[PDB]
Amino acid sequence: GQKVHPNGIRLGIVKPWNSTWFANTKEFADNLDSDFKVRQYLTKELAKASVSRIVIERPAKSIRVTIHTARPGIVIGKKGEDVEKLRKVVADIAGVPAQINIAEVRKPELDAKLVADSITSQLERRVMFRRAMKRAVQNAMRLGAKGIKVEVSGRLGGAEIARTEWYREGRVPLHTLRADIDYNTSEAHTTYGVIGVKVWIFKGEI
Amino acid sequence: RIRIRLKAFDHRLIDQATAEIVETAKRTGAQVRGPIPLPTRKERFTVLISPHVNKDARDQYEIRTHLRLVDIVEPTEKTVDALMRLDLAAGVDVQISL
Amino acid sequence: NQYYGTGRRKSSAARVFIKPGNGKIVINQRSLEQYFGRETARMVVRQPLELVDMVEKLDLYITVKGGGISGQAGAIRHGITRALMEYDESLRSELRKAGFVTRDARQVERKKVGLRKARRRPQFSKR
Amino acid sequence: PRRRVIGQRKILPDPKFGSELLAKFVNILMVDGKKSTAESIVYSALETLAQRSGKSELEAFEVALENVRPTVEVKSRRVGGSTYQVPVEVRPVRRNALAMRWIVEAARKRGDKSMALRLANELSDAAENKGTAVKKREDVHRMAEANKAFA
Amino acid sequence: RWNAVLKLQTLPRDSSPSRQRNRCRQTGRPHGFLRKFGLSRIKVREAAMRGEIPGLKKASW
Amino acid sequence: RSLKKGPFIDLHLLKKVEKAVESGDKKPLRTWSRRSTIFPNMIGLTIAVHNGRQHVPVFVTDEMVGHKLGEFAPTRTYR
RNA sequence: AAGAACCUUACCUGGUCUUGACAUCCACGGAAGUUUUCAGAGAUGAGAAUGUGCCUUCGGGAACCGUGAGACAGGUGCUGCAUGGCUGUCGUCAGCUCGUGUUGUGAAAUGUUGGGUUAAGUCCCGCAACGAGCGCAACCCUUAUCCUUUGUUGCCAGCGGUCCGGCCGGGAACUCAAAGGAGACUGCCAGUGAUAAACUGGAGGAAGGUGGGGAUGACGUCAAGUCAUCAUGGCCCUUACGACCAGGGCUACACACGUGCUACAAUGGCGCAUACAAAGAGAAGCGACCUCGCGAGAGCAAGCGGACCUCAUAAAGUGCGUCGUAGUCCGGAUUGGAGUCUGCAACUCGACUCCAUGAAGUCGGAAUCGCUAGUAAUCGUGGAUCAGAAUGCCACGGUGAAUAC
Ligand SMILES: [Mg+2]
Ligand SMILES: [Mg+2]
Ligand SMILES: [Mg+2]
Ligand SMILES: [Mg+2]
Ligand SMILES: [Mg+2]
Ligand SMILES: [Mg+2]
Ligand SMILES: [Mg+2]
Ligand SMILES: [Mg+2]
Ligand SMILES: [Mg+2]
Ligand SMILES: [Mg+2]
Ligand SMILES: [Mg+2]
Ligand SMILES: [Mg+2]
Ligand SMILES: [Mg+2]
Ligand SMILES: [Mg+2]
Ligand SMILES: [Mg+2]
Ligand SMILES: [Mg+2]
Ligand SMILES: [Mg+2]
Ligand SMILES: [Mg+2]
Ligand SMILES: [Mg+2]
Ligand SMILES: [Mg+2]
Ligand SMILES: [Mg+2]
Ligand SMILES: [Mg+2]
Ligand SMILES: [Mg+2]
Ligand SMILES: [Mg+2]
Ligand SMILES: [Mg+2]
């Protein structure tokens, strides 16, 4: 969209990076490739756990990953057995010793990545978008959001021509760098094509 | 004698790493000159934005590589060797040299 | 006694050390007249020590680095203007009228995308 | 502009001579942004003119500029019909700048030896009133007083 | 030349750097590539705006 | 004229020169390598050079020293 | 398209393959890999070699190679008028809307219009409306002044020894480097103005009126662009629209158009001398010094993963001499000969250098373009793409205007 990405324009203001590792030009590209590969693998296996965001850092010659989820039971289960296999496989793919950590994020409905997935999941199960999206809105504000905005684009309802529909409630100042906006997207693969979902959540002014 | 250089991308994380280094160095010994600012590297990139034509649409990016330098001339070695290996350097690059 | 002035203009940092005595001007450990003064700041460097008093009243030692002809000229002029604390700041009242105290913040404007230099917009055909 | 009043600062007075008008003349005569060449050329022409005419340095060119300054200029105006050459009153600074530009262009179009001598020749023939700057100068005077009622 | 040493070109002319194109790593594009991040214009930006590449920020000097 | 200080010649083409000289001119030898250099070792020989579709024969002469094998092969077609 | 001689590269002509170049299930055989030879343009077939190791439950696996069957794999193939994502433009113009309320049978209106003012739907007063949202400003970066801390690989004011070079004792004042703070907010005054908003001027102040610049792009329009970056609905191919290789082509050329570079010269050309900058890159990399060469370059080859070393002696500028207004000591295309250098490979089709020739061009029709201050104008330096390539793109500095009634 012609609007600059909120999660990219505030990286140096109120949005920490999802990767905090340092490296020279000799291995910067290799580190990027490893990070992308591990993220792509992990997000597929942990689809049920509803991972919000995955942060990766470089301890003293090793790989450390921290995944924030609202359903730590699936990834933890009994003892650390379900995380041991994930640790060993991520270490295998990264080529260096790995350490994975689980973080709990309560009130999942207030998370952008998560709210979207909900929507997309629903749509994929032939649910009326209009209402899928309206609940998302209400849910959130109930929880306390100072604002929320939802948008869905594509062949809504299997129509012959694509259409975009959005709902905005509360206050969502996109030009205020002081404010923090949790922005995220998500896609769906329905029999009629691909439907894009896009959610902004405004939590505070600073 | 022993000069230490730290590299990072953030300006305050390097400051806290240097503060930790100097505090531990003065605790275990003496003769600390404090961190030296030195120049900061500004790696500038520019990338075309549109996936097709539209040459004018461009985005400018820059990476701020911050560098700090601190040296110690402490005589005793049992303090410097103890200072090493106990500090995580706030998870940013650091090098040991004579 | 020694008196210091910084002086700046277009990334041209100067250092002016005024002091009593009846010496000459010295810029970069060398004479300005030897350094092409008759056209290099022919009457820019020696502006401030003309209007308020005579040139041959205070010795000084100047040294400037970075910039060009007019860059050094303006840097030294600004430094000298902020280096005339011989007796209080009564002379700054007169130098304010002449406008020499304030520096020239004007600087080279960056080169924008889609343009050639700063504002030269490439010509387009037809409308 | 259309809404905000504007005004430019005053250039530094000409070196040594201290002639603000001479400093403006070097600005107009400047080409490609080179004040050194313009200053050298103007001083060469000034001293040549002074020694040729036997006159002083400051006002020798002042006389020529006074004798090559116009009074009215035709402005292309068309209120209801086609263009009408409506003469108007010339501002003081505008008169001065226009005469200066006339002198500079008249020296430009010459081919005598080089700028140093061409400028001196233009000044001499402007003082005498037998140059090309004066020849172009009388045109506005003859074309004045055409259409007053229109504005 | 020195003897027939030059003629020893029986190699498959693949080891020479000239044969390698150095395309992108996620998708693969001959054009719009840079050495630093090892990806291509488009992909790079996606990562930078999503906040994946460390130390990358908008330039507004 | 240019290109370092020495000529270049193809090897699987250099395998044909010795056979051609030992057995004498028998027939133009069809080849694709547009890289070999007319070296004296070729006066009195004919070579067929590929242009994409058909191999054009060409007879080598004495004054083709600084000229390459593919040089005498017109690939541009005009009305 | 931020790098078409191979590759890139799909396209053309040829020579090859059909569970395949690539993922995955199964069977059998075989360590991988390193060396050469025959034919052939190569791919490719066709041999000799060498090798036959880890786990090993002793019927095998894991890393990997060869052959075979079938599910498949594959498509830069079509539809941007099915789409996601991303982008251009109106346009950084100030507008675009929603709640209740009220008016109208209704589509709708109001607010959001009016009197002032502003760069602004910015603010004040009035008012049948009272509030809010997106947008404007403001938070962000950079730049202009000052202060605190720190002081090397940077600096040298006061002192000293000084091959009298900041180079060596030393110091940290200062430039500077990078972290944190102060400052500018119509704030203090005068006048104008419905006494309000605001406007004009003055003082102070480095910076006076969102100080300069950047990022920031509202609801929407153009079925605007991209199925080729990627993903993806539908359709189609699958013993070929898939896959491998040699060469060729994308660089053609009776014409037209767009964007640029170099010139028509004396504000200049040439020779000698000689000034003054910023911002960047560097490990299959930057490549001092010294030696050879009229040259592109070659040998030696320290230092440097970087305020240290290198790229790298900025050009304009100014001090002298020559040319003295011409198709010229301007102008450099074309062309011949001879060379340097990247690369398996410079012929189709690269860059640079030495010698020789020296077209057009003497300011340019209708028409049309950019720019209001460090602007335009003109002069140099760097970076990405990249083995080897710029007059293009991105980026830094020097000199530095004219005119806005
Ligand atoms: Mg363009
Ligand atoms: Mg410039
Ligand atoms: Mg290449
Ligand atoms: Mg693909
Ligand atoms: Mg090709
Ligand atoms: Mg479209
Ligand atoms: Mg009603
Ligand atoms: Mg309206
Ligand atoms: Mg209305
Ligand atoms: Mg109004
Ligand atoms: Mg408003
Ligand atoms: Mg001394
Ligand atoms: Mg004021
Ligand atoms: Mg704004
Ligand atoms: Mg934009
Ligand atoms: Mg269309
Ligand atoms: Mg189209
Ligand atoms: Mg090929
Ligand atoms: Mg092409
Ligand atoms: Mg010449
Ligand atoms: Mg380079
Ligand atoms: Mg550097
Ligand atoms: Mg020549
Ligand atoms: Mg001529
Ligand atoms: Mg290259």
Curated annotation (Swiss-Prot), chain A:
Alphabetical list of Pfam families matching this protein: KH_2 (PF07650), Ribosomal_S3_C (PF00189)
Domain KH type-2 span(s) in chain numbering: 38-106
Gene3D superfamilies: 3.30.300.20, Ribosomal protein S3, C-terminal domain
Xref: SMART domains: KH (SM00322)
Quaternary structure and interacting proteins, as annotated: Part of the 30S ribosomal subunit. Forms a tight complex with proteins S10 and S14. Some nascent polypeptide chains are able to cross-link to this protein in situ.
Key word RNA-binding present: yes
PROSITE patterns: KH_TYPE_2, RIBOSOMAL_S3
GO CC terms: cytosolic small ribosomal subunit
InterPro entries: KH_dom, KH_dom-like_a/b, KH_dom_type_2, KH_sf_prok-type, Ribosomal_S3_C_sf, Ribosomal_uS3_bac-typ, Ribosomal_uS3_C, Ribosomal_uS3_CS
Any GO molecular function: mRNA binding
Protein's recorded name: Small ribosomal subunit protein uS3
One GO biological process term: translation
Family (UniProt): Belongs to the universal ribosomal protein uS3 family.
Keywords for this protein: Ribonucleoprotein, Ribosomal protein, RNA-binding, rRNA-binding
Function field: Binds the lower part of the 30S subunit head. Binds mRNA in the 70S ribosome, positioning it for translation.
Curated annotation (Swiss-Prot), chain D:
Family per similarity comment: Belongs to the universal ribosomal protein uS7 family.
Keywords: Ribonucleoprotein, Ribosomal protein, RNA-binding, rRNA-binding, tRNA-binding
Portion of the parent chain present: 2 to 152 of 179
Record's keyword annotation contains RNA-binding: yes
Function: One of the primary rRNA binding proteins, it binds directly to 16S rRNA where it nucleates assembly of the head domain of the 30S subunit. Is located at the subunit interface close to the decoding center, where it has been shown to contact mRNA. Has been shown to contact tRNA in both the P and E sites; it probably blocks exit of the E site tRNA.
tRNA-binding found in the keyword field: yes
Protein's GO biological process: cytoplasmic translation; negative regulation of translation; ribosomal small subunit assembly; translation
Impact when changing residue 35 to A/E: Defective in ribosome assembly
Other facts noted in the record for this chain: The strain K12 sequence is shown. Has been predicted to contact the N-terminal domain of IF-3 based on footprint studies; exactly how IF-3 interacts with the 30S subunit is controversial.
Protein's UniProt name: Small ribosomal subunit protein uS7
Gene Ontology molecular function terms on file: mRNA binding; rRNA binding; structural constituent of ribosome; tRNA binding
Subunit architecture: Part of the 30S ribosomal subunit. Contacts proteins S9 and S11. Cross-links to IF3 and the P and E site tRNAs.
Species per Swiss-Prot/TrEMBL record: Escherichia coli (strain K12)
Any one of the GO CC terms: cytosol
